[PDB]
């Protein structure tokens, strides 16, 4: 046994972090870097959608947890990740820093500050994908949110807890009406009564960074940076970042909603959200559906939007108002995604 024991001992070297150290139980080894996925051997105590670091600064969240290895999507460019790299689990489900220390700041889908104004003050870290409130806790909408548009006020009124969809072609003024709402909120956002105070959240999915910068400048001009948070997922960003950003923004808004306050959230261009999800799905060899959109495109938007409603008095009578933006292509509302 001495010869087998010592030859097994020298086998324990030069294999390094594949069976030897950490037993690949809290660590992993990149088997192959794919389109936007990374097959990783190891991570035996990993749970699903657990945030993982690839020892290069890029993040990852696990879809595929089949017995052999774990399939990890890449929160960033897949150039950084390399086959044979060591990965480590963060031990927490994908979460975004939440709290009242985010107004006046812009962040990404992972809550990391991009404005360069310093670190973000957080009162907590809620999961990006959280369960929507049930049937019991909600309450019918009664308080009106004033958009400032005569068309949207006298006609098609919008209340606190209602999900009103902005549909239009490429150049119609959806961003314009959303900005008009966020600026009209200034009248009551500078007072004292919190019941009329409406904090705001803007979601930039697939938008140009230049357009986002101009938008931030516009909020600067009208002193709307306060009581407002902007999450950015530019068109140059990886598809997973765009797919994740709306859920994190929903968590940010749900913080205010469950803390008794009222929040406005604008899901600009959820059509590009669906496009990013489609790209992620077909990179995962998922069956295409109508216009090759995977079947769960409805489920995505459903779970995303239903997290915004008026709460009953027993919870704290908080509210979350969602303003999705969908770009109909050809002026038709009879298409699958619309």
């Amino acid at each position: 046994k001495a010869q087998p024991t010592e030859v097994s001992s020298i086998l324990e070297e030069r294999i390094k972090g594949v069976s030897d150290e950490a037993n690949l139980n809290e660590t992993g080894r990149v088997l192959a870097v794919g389109d936007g996925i990374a097959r990783v051997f190891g991570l035996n105590n990993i749970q699903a959608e657990e945030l993982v670091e690839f020892s290069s600064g890029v993040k990852g969240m696990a879809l595929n947890l089949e017995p052999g290895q774990v399939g990890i999507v890449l929160f960033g460019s897949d150039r950084l990740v390399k086959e044979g790299e060591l990965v480590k689990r963060t031990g927490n489900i994908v979460d975004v820093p939440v709290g009242p220390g985010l107004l006046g700041r812009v962040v990404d889908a992972l809550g990391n500050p991009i404005d360069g104004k310093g670190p973000i003050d957080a009162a907590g870290r809620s999961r990006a994908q959280v369960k929507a409130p049930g049937i019991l806790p909600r309450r019918s909408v009664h308080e009106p949110v004033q958009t400032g548009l005569k068309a949207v006020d006298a006609l098609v009124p919008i209340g606190r807890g209602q999900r009103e969809l902005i549909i239009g072609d490429r150049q119609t003024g959806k961003t314009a009406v959303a900005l008009d709402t966020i600026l009209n909120q200034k009248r009551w956002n500078n007072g004292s009564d919190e019941s009329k105070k409406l904090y705001c959240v803007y979601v930039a999915v697939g938008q140009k960074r230049s357009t986002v910068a101009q938008l931030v400048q516009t909020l600067e001009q009208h002193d709307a940076m306060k009581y407002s948070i902007i999450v950015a997922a530019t068109a140059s960003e990886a598809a997973p970042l765009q797919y994740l950003a709306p859920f994190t923004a929903a968590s940010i808004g749900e913080w205010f909603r469950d803390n008794g306050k009222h929040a406005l959230i604008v899901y600009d261009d959820l059509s590009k959200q669906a496009v990013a999800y489609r790209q992620l799905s077909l990179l995962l060899r998922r069956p295409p559906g109508r216009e090759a959109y995977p079947g769960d495109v409805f489920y995505l938007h459903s779970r995303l939007l239903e997290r915004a409603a008026k709460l009953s008095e027993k919870e704290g009578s908080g509210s979350l108002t969602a303003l999705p933006v969908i770009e109909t292509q050809g002026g038709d509302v009879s298409a699958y995604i619309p």
Binding site: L11, I15, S19
Partner: protein
């Protein structure tokens, strides 16, 4: 003409080994050496089968297969060739060992645990499956009674079901 069909799927390695043995000789020596190799790999499971992971480079595989052949070169005949081909091909070496054992036992043993309505375990060490099942069943019912537990036998329950169905 190997006695049994393994239908491929990682099992063709065992059939190839058996054919290589049958073409010249050593149906038994290679198999007993392979049994010893499996005993060795299960002796140190944390170093035995964890090392059969696919996150392990080609020359790592050469190193591990060289490490397998020790203790007076127990790997005798073409089994070293099997280790080599498994180094540059699919790695884990347990299932095809079982397939090869199944093949060699069909060559020499021909034992099946039948009993139809009886859930016995009557292994039969004979190539003639004609009446030896009677002796095997008699011995396994006279003594032991390993499970012999049908829980409920099918004919009465199925007949009652079909009768009450009309």
């Amino acid at each position: 003409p190997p006695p049994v069909r393994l239908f491929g799927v990682e099992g063709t390695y065992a059939t190839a080994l058996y054919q290589a043995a049958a073409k010249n000789s050593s149906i038994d020596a290679a198999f007993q050496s392979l049994q010893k190799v499996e005993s060795t790999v299960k002796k140190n499971p944390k170093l035995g089968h964890l090392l059969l992971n696919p996150a392990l480079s080609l020359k790592d595989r050469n190193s591990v297969i060289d490490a397998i052949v020790e203790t007076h070169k127990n790997l005798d005949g073409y089994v070293v060739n099997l280790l080599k081909v498994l180094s540059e091909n699919n790695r884990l070496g347990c299932f095809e060992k079982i397939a090869s054992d199944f093949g060699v036992l069909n060559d020499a043993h021909n034992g099946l645990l039948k009993g139809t309505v009886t859930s016995a375990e009557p292994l039969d060490p004979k190539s003639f499956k004609r009446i030896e099942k009677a002796l095997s069943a008699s011995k396994l019912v006279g003594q032991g009674k390993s499970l012999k537990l049908e829980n409920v036998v099918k004919p009465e329950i199925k007949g009652g079901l079909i009768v009450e169905l009309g």
